[PDB]
Amino acid sequence: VVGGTEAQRNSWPSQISLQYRSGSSWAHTCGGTLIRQNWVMTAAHCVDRELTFRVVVGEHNLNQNNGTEQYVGVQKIVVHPYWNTDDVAAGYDIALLRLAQSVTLNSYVQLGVLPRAGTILANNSPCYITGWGLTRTNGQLAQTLQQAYLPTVDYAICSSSSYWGSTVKNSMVCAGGDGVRSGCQGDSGGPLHCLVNGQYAVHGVTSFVSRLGCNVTRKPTVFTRVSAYISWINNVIASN
Ligand SMILES: [Ca+2]
Numbered sequence: 202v203v204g205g206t207e208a209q210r211n212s213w214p215s216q217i218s219l220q221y222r223s224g225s226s227w228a229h230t231c232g233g234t235l236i237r238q239n240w241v242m243t244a245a246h247c248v249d250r251e252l253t254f255r256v257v258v259g260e261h262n263l264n265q266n267n268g269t270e271q272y273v274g275v276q277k278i279v280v281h282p283y284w285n286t287d288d289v290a291a292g293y294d295i296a297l298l299r300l301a302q303s304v305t306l307n308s309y310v311q312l313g314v315l316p317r318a319g320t321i322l323a324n325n326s327p328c329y330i331t332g333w334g335l336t337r338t339n340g341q342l343a344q345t346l347q348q349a350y351l352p353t354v355d356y357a358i359c360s361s362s363s364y365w366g367s368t369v370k371n372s373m374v375c376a377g378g379d380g381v382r383s384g385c386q387g388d389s390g391g392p393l394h395c396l397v398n399g400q401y402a403v404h405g406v407t408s409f410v411s412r413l414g415c416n417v418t419r420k421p422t423v424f425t426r427v428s429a430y431i432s433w434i435n436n437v438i439a440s441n
Contacts, residue, residue: 202332203416204382205349210261213331215313218260221252232332232391234313234403238303243390244406245284245296259309262345269309274301292372294408294425297437314402318431324355328395334387338414342387351376354421364419372429374405378421385415393424
């Protein structure tokens with residue numbers, strides 16, 4: 202997260218860290234959202250490479266024991282059937298991970314709230330992006346969870362020529378673009394929490410930013426619109 206601030210230790214309990222094994226150590230690669238005690242929602246591009254993945258819940262500082270973390274392996278990966286690695290702009294950047302075991306819920310580990318199917322947010326809706334991703338374009342990962350206020354930019358505006366143009370679809374949500382705050386590498390797959398009816402709900406899964414850099418004016422961070430995949434999500438969890 203570029204231009205963010207350190208999040209309170211228990212502000213976003215559904216946030217998870219998706220890590221892969223590198224030799225004899227683990228490395229953070231993406232964010233995600235705990236949606237069931239044994240299911241995690243993340244971006245499909247986070248699991249394109251065939252590596253060994255593990256999920257960490259109740260995490261705050263990546264480099265030190267907080268005494269609240271739970272480490273669980275990934276048993277099965279279900280990527281959306283239409284996902285195409287060579288065309289992230291085509292959408293469908295979403296995947297579900299079945300955990301090897303159910304995690305225990307407490308003040309640091311809670312399920313994320315999903316929006317009702319089809320819900321579209323008005324322009325400039327209040328949302329926050331969270332993650333341990335780069336704090337600057339071509340920078341380094343954050344040690345502690347960061348958050349940044351990223352109001353939404355409706356489809357009409359986001360798909361205009363001055364912004365993303367035809368690169369963005371209605372199955373996506375745009376947020377930010379002020380040239381100061383944005384998601385960045387390492388935030389992928391993470392949540393976009395938006396306040397609706399007094400409750401924070403996860404409306405997006407971080408998908409992509411500009412090739413020119415993370416925080417670029419008129420190039421808001423793009424997220425997979427969760428509300429467009431509710432039926433798919435429910436079908437997978439109830440089936441597997
Ligand atoms: Ca830790």
